Swiss-Prot record, chains A, B:
Protein origin, superkingdom: Viruses
Function noted in UniProt: Cleaves the C-terminus of replicase polyprotein at 11 sites. Recognizes substrates containing the core sequence [ILMVF]-Q-|-[SGACN]. Cleaves and inactivates human TRMT1, preventing tRNA guanine(26)-dimethylation of tRNAs. May cleave human NLRP1 in lung epithelial cells, thereby activating the NLRP1 inflammasome pathway. May cleave human GSDMD, triggering alternative GSDME-mediated epithelial cell death upon activation of the NLRP1 inflammasome, which may enhance the release interleukins 1B, 6, 16 and 18. Also able to bind an ADP-ribose-1''-phosphate (ADRP).
Locations listed in the record: Host cytoplasm; Host Golgi apparatus; Host nucleus
Source species taxonomy: Viruses, Riboviria, Orthornavirae, Pisuviricota, Pisoniviricetes
Active site: 41 (for 3cl-pro activity), 145 (nucleophile)
Shown chain mapped onto the complete sequence: 3264 to 3569 of 7096
Residue ranges occupied by any Peptidase C30 domain in the UniProt entry: 1-306
Name by which UniProt lists this protein: 3C-like proteinase nsp5
Effect of residue 142 to A: Does not affect ability to cleave and inactivate human TRMT1
Subunit structure: 3CL-PRO exists as monomer and homodimer. Only the homodimer shows catalytic activity. Interacts with host FBXO22; this interaction promotes the proteasomal degradation of nsp5.
Impact upon substituting residue 205 to V: In strain: Zeta/P.2
Length: 306, 306
């Protein structure tokens, strides 16, 4: 029993984390096959970051200007190339501890595990969510840049995120592994507006099914609701609108608990309108939106990776 | 910036997790040097668990009755021995991926990372705390037993906990690596009483310093308090009594934020007496007691392991 916020195991990602230094600037990079990926702002000074021209800045650098060190071994750089906002540094040796892997661009609402790294060595791991406004609420100090977010299926590491920058608001932003930003953000140090955030409705529901499965059931109501009615309430509490695809995805959980989705939607609406009234759910006094329906399922059936 | 509930990296522990099977019963074991550690209830049937005599049950088994498989490779067992509630199975091969390590018996209040495993392969990792009544609030399904909790300092893995059983109350219990239970619990399937729990005062304070460090400051008050006065309030809200050792441990945080401990104790007392009043702190509507003062420090200075 029990319900925790769990991350994937970090073994396979740990053996790919290298330290990249170019001039003074040092940040983390990801060594797969014979290539190293890092944020392209490793060629900038603190001053450059105000308004960089990345083309012109790169024209100055040569292969020997990029130092890459894995533990104690030093890689030698043979080529270098710029794809969107990441740099791809070709090296002479292929990584012996390279796992099977893909690169994937996720959607808002999806969750993933972040391995937090300073100077190419690992600090810690945590689970988190791509918000609806494409930010994330991390824990990232100076030097953290180039830490990666990933998922594990079976034995295949799916890299979804690379950390680039902190916003003035205290929140985080970044790219996929081909160098494209999630959201409107750019790698210039200027004031940038994240839109209004919303709560991820489909995930709050997933978490309610987890509470029932674990024995916490006080929020269950006699009443019931329709989709369109439920969505009118949601909207005024800045919740994400619920579609049929979302109901469909909640099916397995509705079956094993025998509580129809719309009956759960009615339970939620009351919580929105009356608050929790000083009770708790899975030990939280707020409504948690950072487990997907696949997360809850996996946590409850105990899937395992290898 | 940011503050997450973070676990240590799991790489080094993952390469020690084996599957132990004895008769029908399969559970997880830990392969270091030439020895495998597992829960001694791997020699029990579901029926035995009601009132087992572990001596007599073991006298029946021989080396060849214990099957140990790491991935695809099979170990051969040369000896077997029972120390308190764990079994030590001597094998012919030493583990090539054995990290430097110790075994440590922690104290209530300490935190640690759990690697959750079914059938010798890893599922996920999370941070948690030894409660004052020596239980823990995990996420553990059937088959989980023999999962380990650990800390990492520098490059040295310190194993502190092995999972044995779930209590009827929905909470978890277990042993150190020499086989001694934390708390009053025994490995018999019977009803067992955990005492009254308390909130870990020193840790709530640590977490308040983390909120100030991150910019959340509304709970700061003009007032102030004494130790003895603060402890009279605490007690009636079932908080752990604060000693001078606890103040001493909070020193570094008091310095860098320039808020004296007793001033923080006064802030807390008001929260106890007036609630949070529908505000949040680091995004929580409750008072969090699962970061130590060493945790917060480490998270805020970005220490790293290697
Ligand atoms: Cl909460």
């Amino acid at each position: 029993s029990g319900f925790r916020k769990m991350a994937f195991p970090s073994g396979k990602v740990e053996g790919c984390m290298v330290q990249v230094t170019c001039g003074t600037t040092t940040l983390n990079g990801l060594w797969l096959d014979d290539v190293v990926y890092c944020p392209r702002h490793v060629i900038c000074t603190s001053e450059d970051m105000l308004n960089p021209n990345y083309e012109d800045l790169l024209i100055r650098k040569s292969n020997h200007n990029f130092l890459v060190q894995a533990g104690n071994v030093q890689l030698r750089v043979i080529g270098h190339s710029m794809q969107n906002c990441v740099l791809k540094l070709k090296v002479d040796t292929a990584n012996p501890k390279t796992p099977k892997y893909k690169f994937v661009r996720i959607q808002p609402g999806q969750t993933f595990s972040v391995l937090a790294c300073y100077n190419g060595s690992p600090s810690g791991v945590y689970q988190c969510a791509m918000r609806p406004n494409f930010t994330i609420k991390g824990s990232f100090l100076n030097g953290s840049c180039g830490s990666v977010g990933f998922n594990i299926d079976y034995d295949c590491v799916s890299f979804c995120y690379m950390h680039h920058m902190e916003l003035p608001t205290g929140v985080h932003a970044g790219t996929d592994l081909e160098g494209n930003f999630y959201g409107p953000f750019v790698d210039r140090q200027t004031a940038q507006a994240a839109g209004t955030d919303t709560t991820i409705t489909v995930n709050v529901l997933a978490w309610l099914y987890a509470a029932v499965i674990n024995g916490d059931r006080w929020f269950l109501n006699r009443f019931t609701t329709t989709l369109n009615d439920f969505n009118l309430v949601a909207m005024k509490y800045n919740y994400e609108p619920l579609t049929q695809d979302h109901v469909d995805i909640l099916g397995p959980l509705s079956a094993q608990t025998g509580i129809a989705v719309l009956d759960m939607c009615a339970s939620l609406k009351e919580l929105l309108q009356n608050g929790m009234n000083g009770r708790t759910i899975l030990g939280s006094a707020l409504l948690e939106d950072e487990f997907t329906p696949f997360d809850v399922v996996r946590q409850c059936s105990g899937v395992t990776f290898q």
